């Protein structure tokens, strides 16, 4: 008998009729709803048109890095650009459409920080659904005051300045526009700029320069975007190409190699995009390196802004 | 001067080299990882092959109902089947790809329960990103001990028993497959489905009156590749029942009617509906980019389901 | 000897080097450009969230009506919603990809008003390219102070209120999205729509009798990915109203009947139609590659709308 | 009360019944309409089968150049070939499906010439809809006596003569034919020839040679067509490839580099096609360089024909 406790919910003391006939919403006008949404979105577009940190790709590595950066420095404008409608990338499932998420120690310390429960198996731990990890990190990241998630939005190119570096921003559009198609062309893009420039477009050496962190995963549909674009622009930079699966070497190397990119200033990488760029092994259905590679890139970025 | 505070993270005291050269994972072999995942998934398939509550569609209405049911009764096996890889349905955005989520009072009381922050505007409140609502409910629902999310899995039919107790259609489970299989035009066919059964039957397949019968709650919305799935399937089988068909947009009438009409379906026993699927079934107005009725319609269906299991 | 005249252009007196090496733009930063565009677009979305006239479809009939309405009443908020990136509909060509545009008299009087040149052939006149007609009307309409063109945006439903004043369907606005979203099979769903409201309602959503009610004019043609949109949606909601269905081609009867039948729709209040959508709704003949009825049907609808707003 | 002025339109004094029952068209026969259209189209195909200026692509740069050329020299046969049904290219919208069109000074002088209204913001001006710019230029260009717009028509190749140059015309088809597909093949093309040749196909050195201006935008679906084709034919000519976004450098360089192409005689370029050919930066949602690069190419072409 547990079936004898009371049925309780948020309206239990206000809705008294069995048929809910005494339920009512406060009244509304359709234009009030429209203006409430549009006003807030334009405020976001105005505020983040110059950003301190631009993160490309809201998968496990990008969101892990966003958490660490924003928690440490709540004053910094952190702009997260995600091409899909749903954020989270490949972290809604384990392998072969199965659920469980394996993370090798010491990645369990990140789970403890986020208060995510797990089963301890000795050298590794298991979160009972990959979806529990990614939804928890999302809930926490999005609550922060200067974080913005621009979902359904795709990076199409980089904003640059002349040689020796730099990146100076990203070129953006609705994903469905970029993926179009048969429709009348053109449909021009928008731009988001990094902190550090004057109104005449030149560098202000007195101001701390913004950074880009690319975490778009390995090569594919929208995959390894910033790695390929840097390699395309620069003749002496070549794409390593992701190698075969080897869990010991892949997870180690992805964590170690994450962070600042050597050939371009103010440019950072984490997650499987690093494996494409640097020619590292893949790891398949294990997730500790994705979280911890985000942690490593976040440390390097935070040190840049500390001065 | 926030820039003077320490750079700290979960590995700050164990990783001491600037270049992270002293970082190390514990060792592993590939088969250990495979077996860790497969063993747990087939334990889920075994355990939930008979379920107490089957929820079809993990959108705002379905997940809101899952929260209320599971929190109230942690003993019941609650099986959530979602066709997409990412759960959440239409709740990752507001309208026209914009972000803010408007909820009319008294839906703010549900946000207070979930500890979701909002801006109070008088007769309504605003959550700063729709994604904050849906990820918060997901995080809380999935932590519960007898809840399972079968994502990338679709419902393609109902399991039934013969007419009346009372009504034409009598529900006893759902017919399932990987979503990509159901959508697979047109490789070698067939690829047969699997089945998940409701509580209440003997090993010979007949009703066991000493057990409380399980229930289905369908929350598949009004549209998409599927959408209004269980509404259309009941209407198809039962020749004396037709789809009302969703009408034009009218927020005052839509939100009221969707909340009130949610719950038990008359004509089929042990069958419940919430969210925009109710508007398709009962011929109600739509509401567009406002979300209070989705959450509160899930709450109403959950109340009726919880009362079924109380006695 | 035209080849002896001077080569002159807008920069002839300021750019003096043969190689243009002394040419210079004023300096700029990328965020200045972004903010200049976004600030203006959200001002449009705020201002037109309540509109006096909503015109659905920017083809020859819709733009002709827009011209007459806005020129007569420059105070009214006229909101033009067009699904394609380029406005103009079927008026960029004549028939079979050929160019010339034939207009039967007295449609030449509309061309005279717009100062569009033509060849007089007696009972009809010819504009040398259909593209000259449509680009001229566009240039003039868009200059007007309270006209807004929302291109790349589609209407996917009607905003309604409950039956009779009098008739089954009562219009109060339109439901909108980016065209590419509405057509998006089959990414994560939902992606919710937005709404644009007609003048005449209080903040509690009820009719305000002290204000003139806004109107919708649908001019979406007979075909295409959408097409005859509002005709089909009214017919779908109202079970006692059916589509006439467009008949065979007959120029004498089609052009006459389309002009006369344009204007207020009986059965729905504050709802108007023009162009080939009228032929679908009322079961009229088609006319093919002749354009006088498209322009003049817009003029007739505009007269009826202007009379509504006069008192 | 503005609602008290009269309701007036072009038929107000001729249509007297409230129900429009006294409205009538002059009568017609279906074959009269058909013959009116076909006769005029064949006259165009006959007249422009030899042309003085062939402009490929009716976007902002191509139409701006057409305006300047035709206004200065109304005697020259200017043949505009556009693959889409609607001309205008990417100039129906600003960026990210938004409307406003930003043009940096001194591009405002071109707007003044065309009588297009704008908001002055100091170093730049704003046209309230990109659609107002492009429809105004279209209306004015099309009224000119020796200009022809062949829309729904695609350039598939160049007509050439043997090495040292030249281009001698273009190879054309309906766009839907070129894009086909599964249908029976072949469907052969047509040709449009440049002024300057004799009836035996050889150069007439006494006559002024026609020119091609290619303005097909940057690489894509139908993008950068003539740039790629020249590079394909010539082994020692390579495609620069468009670089990252940088508004200061892109707009300057696109204007300066527009005009005559160095490796081929009687060949000219403007707009974003120049950025692909010469490896220049892109500029995104700003439009001054498109108009003014058209102006520069027009100056060079007009000087060729002045003799």
Domains in chain C, start-ordered, CATH in brackets?
A: 19-49 (6.10.250.2840), 50-311 (3.50.50.60)
Contact C222, C260 (CB under 8 A): no
Q: How near does any CA of chain A get to the CA of D150, in Å?
A: 17
Whether omega for the bond prior to residue D106 falls within 30 degrees of 0, making it cis, is: yes
Tell if the CB–CB gap between C158 and B249 is shorter than 8 Å: yes
Residue of B142, B302, D151 whose CA lies nearest to A99: B142
Closest chain D residue by Cα to residue A184: D89
Whether omega for the bond prior to residue C166 falls within 30 degrees of 0, making it cis, is: yes
In a 10 Å sphere around its CB, with 0-12 CB exposed, 13-18 middle and 19+ buried, how is residue D163 labelled? exposed
Q: Was A90 annotated as part of a binding site?
A: yes
Query: For residue D267, what are the CA distances in angstroms to A216, C19, D227, D276?
Result: 42, 17, 10, 16
Tell if the CB–CB gap between C237 and B224 is shorter than 8 Å: no
Residue of B25, B10, B54 whose CA lies nearest to B270: B54
How far is the C-alpha of D56 from the C-alpha of D154, rounded, in Å? 9
Q: What is the 3-state secondary structure (H, E, C) of A58-109?
A: CCHHHHHHHHHHHHHCCCCCEEEEECCCCCCCCCCCCCCCCCCEEEECCCHH
Q: Was B121 annotated as part of a binding site?
A: no
Residue of C218, C258, C241 whose CA lies nearest to C167: C241
Q: Was A242 annotated as part of a binding site?
A: no
Tell if the CB–CB gap between D93 and A187 is shorter than 8 Å: yes
Which of D58, D284, D285 best tests the A interface by mutation, with the highest count of A CBs <10 A? D284
Q: Does D221 touch chain A (CB under 8 A)?
A: yes
Across the interface, of B95, B223, B288, the residue whose CB is closest to C189 is B223
Q: Which helix (H) or strand (E) holds A302?
A: helix A288-306
Whether omega for the bond prior to residue D186 falls within 30 degrees of 0, making it cis, is: yes
Across the interface, of A5, A7, A10, the residue whose CB is closest to B113 is A10
Contact B285, C172 (CB under 8 A): no
Residue of B116, B63, B68, B49 whose CA lies nearest to B91: B63
Q: Which residue has the tokens 């075994």?
A: B46
Residue of D250, D43, D159, A82 whose CA lies nearest to B129: A82
Contact D127, D103 (CB under 8 A): yes
Contact C261, C283 (CB under 8 A): no
- What is the number of residues in chain D? 307
Q: Which helix (H) or strand (E) holds D54?
A: strand D53-56
Contact B247, B115 (CB under 8 A): no
Q: How near does any CA of chain C get to the CA of B224, in Å?
A: 6
Closest chain D residue by Cα to residue A230: D244
Backbone dihedral angles phi then psi of residue C294, each to the nearest 5 degrees: -65, -50
Tell me the sheet residues that pair with C80.
C55, C149
First to last CA, chain D: 62
Q: Strand B124-127's sheet: what is its strand order?
A: B101-104, B124-127, B119-120
Tokens (6 digits) for A6 = 């009371």
Contact D297, D259 (CB under 8 A): yes
Q: Was A101 annotated as part of a binding site?
A: no
Tell if the CB–CB gap between B289 and C177 is shorter than 8 Å: no
Q: Which residue has the tokens 């230029």?
A: D137
* Chain A neighbours, 3+ Cβ pairs < 8 A: B, C, D
Residue of A38, C30, C40 whose CA lies nearest to D99: C40
Tell if the CB–CB gap between B93 and C172 is shorter than 8 Å: no
CA C155, C159, C160, C165 torsion: positive or negative? negative
Query: For residue C89, what are the CA distances in angstroms to A77, B228, C83, C235, D210?
Result: 43, 35, 10, 24, 34
Closest chain C residue by Cα to residue A178: C180
Q: How far is CA D288 from the centre of its chain?
A: 16
Contacts of A229 in chain D (CB under 8 A): 244
Q: How near does any CA of chain C get to the CA of A218, in Å?
A: 21
Residue of D10, D136, D5, A31 whose CA lies nearest to C75: D5
Q: Does A36 touch chain C (CB under 8 A)?
A: no
Tokens (6 digits) for A186 = 């053109």
Whether omega for the bond prior to residue C190 falls within 30 degrees of 0, making it cis, is: yes
How far is the C-alpha of C252 from the C-alpha of C260, rounded, in Å? 13
Tell if the CB–CB gap between C191 and B224 is shorter than 8 Å: no
Tell if the CB–CB gap between B10 and A286 is shorter than 8 Å: no
Query: For residue A229, what are the CA distances in angstroms to A221, A272, B15, C89, D102?
Result: 14, 16, 32, 38, 27
Q: How near does any CA of chain B get to the CA of C189, in Å?
A: 5
Residue of B99, D289, B58 whose CA lies nearest to A39: B99
DSSP D282: B
How far is the C-alpha of B247 from the C-alpha of C238, rounded, in Å? 10
DSSP B2: G
Residue of C11, C120, C98 whose CA lies nearest to C288: C98
Q: Which helix (H) or strand (E) holds A110?
A: helix A108-113
Residue of D58, D98, D65, D61 whose CA lies nearest to D82: D58
Contact C225, C205 (CB under 8 A): no
* Chain D neighbours, 3+ Cβ pairs < 8 A: A, C
Q: Following DSSP, what letter does each residue of B275-307 receive, concatenated? A: THHHHHHHT--B--S--HHHHHHHHHHHHHHHH
CA D212, D217, D218, D221 torsion: positive or negative? negative
DSSP B201: B
How far is the C-alpha of B193 from the C-alpha of B172, rounded, in Å? 16
How far is the C-alpha of A103 from the C-alpha of B231, rounded, in Å? 41
Backbone dihedral angles phi then psi of residue C89, each to the nearest 5 degrees: 45, -125
Q: Does A26 touch chain C (CB under 8 A)?
A: no
How far is the C-alpha of C248 from the C-alpha of C225, rounded, in Å? 21
In whole angstroms, how large is the CA radius of gyration of chain B?
22
Tokens (6 digits) for A259 = 């962070």
Across the interface, of A161, A184, A187, the residue whose CB is closest to D246 is A161
Contacts of A204 in chain C (CB under 8 A): none
CA A218, A221, A226, A232 torsion: positive or negative? positive
Tell if the CB–CB gap between A21 and B249 is shorter than 8 Å: no
How far is the C-alpha of C106 from the C-alpha of C228, rounded, in Å? 27
Tell if the CB–CB gap between A92 and B151 is shorter than 8 Å: yes
In a 10 Å sphere around its CB, with 0-12 CB exposed, 13-18 middle and 19+ buried, how is residue A4 labelled? exposed
Tokens (6 digits) for C182 = 């509405």
Q: How near does any CA of chain B get to the CA of C205, in Å?
A: 7
- What are the CB-based long-range contacts (under 8 Å, 24+) for C68-73? C68/C298, C68/C299, C68/C302, C68/C303, C68/C306, C68/D9, C69/C302, C69/C305, C69/C306, C70/C141, C70/C144, C70/C146, C70/C147, C71/C144, C72/C302, C72/C306, C72/D5, C72/D7, C72/D8, C72/D9, C73/C306, C73/C309, C73/D2, C73/D3
DSSP B265: P
**Count of other CB atoms within 10 angstroms of residue A19:** 9
Query: For residue A45, what are the CA distances in angstroms to A39, B81, C38, C129, D99?
Result: 10, 36, 7, 42, 15
Q: Was B276 annotated as part of a binding site?
A: yes
- Where are the alpha helices (H) located in chain B, listed in sequence order? 30-47, 60-72, 108-113, 130-142, 179-182, 229-237, 251-261, 276-282, 292-310
Contact C293, C255 (CB under 8 A): yes
Tell if the CB–CB gap between D143 and C126 is shorter than 8 Å: no
**Count of other CB atoms within 10 angstroms of residue C183:** 16
Tokens (6 digits) for D19 = 């129900």
Tell if the CB–CB gap between C30 and A187 is shorter than 8 Å: no
Residue of B172, B91, B297 whose CA lies nearest to B305: B297
How far is the C-alpha of B105 from the C-alpha of B120, rounded, in Å? 10
Q: What angle do CA B265, B269, B275 make, to 5 degrees?
A: 30
Closest chain C residue by Cα to residue A192: C31
Q: What is the 3-state secondary structure (H, E, C) of chain C?
A: CHHHCCCCCCCCCCCCCCCCCCCCCCCCCHHHHHHHHHHHHHHHHHHCCEECEEEECCCHHHHHHHHHHHHHCCCCCEEEECCCCCCCCCCCCCCCCCCCEEEECCCHHHHHHCCCCCEECCCEEEECCHHHHHHHHHHHHHCCCCEEEECCEEEEEEEEECCCCCCCCEEEEEEEEEHHHHCCCCCCCCCCCEEEEECCECCCCCECCCCCCCEEEECCCCCCCCCCHHHHHHHHHCCCCCCCCCCCECHHHHHHHHHHHCEECCCCECEEECCHHHHHHHCCCECCCCCHHHHHHHHHHHHHHHHHHHC
In a 10 Å sphere around its CB, with 0-12 CB exposed, 13-18 middle and 19+ buried, how is residue B212 labelled? middle
Tokens (6 digits) for C206 = 């009820």
Tell if the CB–CB gap between D10 and C138 is shorter than 8 Å: no
How far is the C-alpha of D304 from the C-alpha of D301, rounded, in Å? 5
Q: How near does any CA of chain B get to the CA of A284, in Å?
A: 9
- Where are the alpha helices (H) located in chain D, listed in sequence order? 30-47, 60-72, 108-113, 130-142, 175-178, 225-233, 247-257, 272-278, 288-306
Contact D133, C143 (CB under 8 A): no
Q: 152-181 in C: which are within 8 Å (CB) of B?
A: 157-162, 169, 172-173, 175-178, 181
Contacts of A215 (CB under 8 A, 6+ apart): A55, A56, A57, A59, A61, A62, A65, A269, A270, A271, A273, A294
Residue burial B7-35, b: 16+ Cβ < 10 Å; e: rest: bebbbeeebeeeebeebebeebeeebbbe
Residue of D270, D277, D272, D267 whose CA lies nearest to D294: D270
Tell if the CB–CB gap between B225 and C186 is shorter than 8 Å: yes
Tell if the CB–CB gap between A30 and C197 is shorter than 8 Å: yes
Tokens (6 digits) for C278 = 């009228």
Tell if the CB–CB gap between A159 and D86 is shorter than 8 Å: no
Q: Which residue has the tokens 């039934």?
A: B160
Backbone dihedral angles phi then psi of residue D202, each to the nearest 5 degrees: -95, 155
CA dihedral B126, B127, B130, B136 (to 10 degrees): -150
Residue of C62, C85, C277 whose CA lies nearest to D85: C85
Q: Does C33 touch chain D (CB under 8 A)?
A: yes
Across the interface, of A160, A186, A187, the residue whose CB is closest to D245 is A160
How far is the C-alpha of A261 from the C-alpha of C153, rounded, in Å? 41
How far is the C-alpha of C188 from the C-alpha of C181, rounded, in Å? 11
How far is the C-alpha of C103 from the C-alpha of C123, rounded, in Å? 9
Q: 198-217 in C: which are within 8 Å (CB) of A?
A: 201-205
How far is the C-alpha of A214 from the C-alpha of A57, rounded, in Å? 7
Whether omega for the bond prior to residue B166 falls within 30 degrees of 0, making it cis, is: yes
Q: Was A161 annotated as part of a binding site?
A: no
Contacts of C188 in chain B (CB under 8 A): 84, 86, 88-89, 92
Contacts of C237 in chain B (CB under 8 A): 247-248
Q: Was D284 annotated as part of a binding site?
A: yes
Whether omega for the bond prior to residue C212 falls within 30 degrees of 0, making it cis, is: no
Q: Was A257 annotated as part of a binding site?
A: no
- Where are the alpha helices (H) located in A154-287, listed in sequence order? 175-178, 225-233, 247-257, 272-278
**Count of other CB atoms within 10 angstroms of residue B44:** 18
- DSSP 3-state assignment of B170? strand
Q: What angle do CA B40, B43, B49 make, to 5 degrees?
A: 140
Q: Was B39 annotated as part of a binding site?
A: no
Q: 103-142 in C: which are within 8 Å (CB) of D?
A: 104-107, 109-110, 112-113, 117, 121-124, 126, 128-129, 131-132, 135-136, 138-139, 142
How far is the C-alpha of B44 from the C-alpha of B38, rounded, in Å? 10
Contacts of A23 (CB under 8 A, 6+ apart): A11, A15, A17, B256, B259, B260, B296
Across the interface, of D24, D40, D110, the residue whose CB is closest to C99 is D40
Residue of B171, B151, B199 whose CA lies nearest to B273: B171
- Beta-carbon-side half-sphere exposure of residue B172 (alpha carbons within 13 Å): 16
Contact C78, C102 (CB under 8 A): no
Contact B287, B295 (CB under 8 A): no
Tokens (6 digits) for B189 = 């066919």
How far is the C-alpha of C8 from the C-alpha of C15, rounded, in Å? 11
CA A101, A104, A110, A115 torsion: positive or negative? positive
Contacts of C114 (CB under 8 A, 6+ apart): C67, C136, C137, C140
Tokens (6 digits) for D190 = 């047509």
- Beta-carbon-side half-sphere exposure of residue B307 (alpha carbons within 13 Å): 12
- DSSP 3-state assignment of D258? coil
Contacts of C36 in chain D (CB under 8 A): 100, 102, 121, 124, 126
Query: Beta strand pairing status for B53-56 and B215-218?
Result: parallel
Q: Which residue has the tokens 């003949």?
A: C285
Residue of C158, C143, C110, C154 whose CA lies nearest to C292: C110
Query: Beta strand pairing status for D267-269 and D259-260?
Result: antiparallel
Contacts of B157 (CB under 8 A, 6+ apart): B174, B175, B193, B233
Q: With left for phi above 0 and alpha for psi between -120 and 50, is residue C205 left, alpha or beta?
A: left
């Amino acid at each position: 008998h547990l079936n004898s406790t009371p049925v309780t919910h948020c309206l239990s003391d206000i809705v008294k009729k069995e048929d809910w006939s005494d339920f009512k919403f406060a009244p509304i006008r359709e234009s009030t709803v429209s203006r409430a949404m549009t006003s807030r979105y334009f405020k976001d577009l105005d505020k983040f048109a110059v950003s301190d940190v631009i993160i490309v790709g809201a998968g496990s590595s990008g969101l892990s890095a966003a958490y660490v950066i924003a928690k440490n420095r709540p004053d910094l404008k952190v702009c997260i650009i995600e091409s899909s409608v749903a954020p989270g990338g490949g972290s809604w499932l384990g392998g072969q459409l199965f659920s469980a998420m394996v993370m090798r120690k010491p990645a369990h310390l990140f789970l403890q920080e986020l208060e995510i429960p797990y089963e301890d198996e000795g050298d590794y731990v298991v979160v009972k659904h990959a979806a529990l990890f990614i939804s928890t990190v999302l809930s926490k990241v999005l609550q922060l005051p200067n974080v913005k998630l621009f979902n359904a939005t795709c990076v199409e190119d980089l904003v640059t300045r002349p040689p020796t570096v730099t990146v100076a921003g990203v070129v953006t559009n609705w994903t469905l526009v970029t993926q179009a198609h048969g429709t009348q062309c053109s449909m021009d893009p928008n731009v988001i700029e990094l902190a550090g420039y004057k109104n005449d477009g030149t560098r202000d050496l007195s101001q701390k320069h913004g950074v880009i962190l690319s975490t778009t995963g390995h090569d594919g549909p929208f995959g390894a975007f910033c790695a390929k674009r840097i390699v395309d622009i620069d003749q002496n930079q070549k794409l390593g190409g992701m190698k075969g699966l080897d869990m010991n070497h892949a997870e180690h190397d992805v964590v170690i190699h994450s962070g600042a990119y050597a050939g371009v200033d103010n440019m950072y990488f984490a997650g499987m995009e690093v494996a494409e760029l640097d020619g590292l092994n893949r790891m398949g259905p294990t997730f500790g390196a994705m979280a911890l590679s985000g942690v490593h890139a976040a440390e390097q970025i935070l040190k840049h802004f500390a001065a």
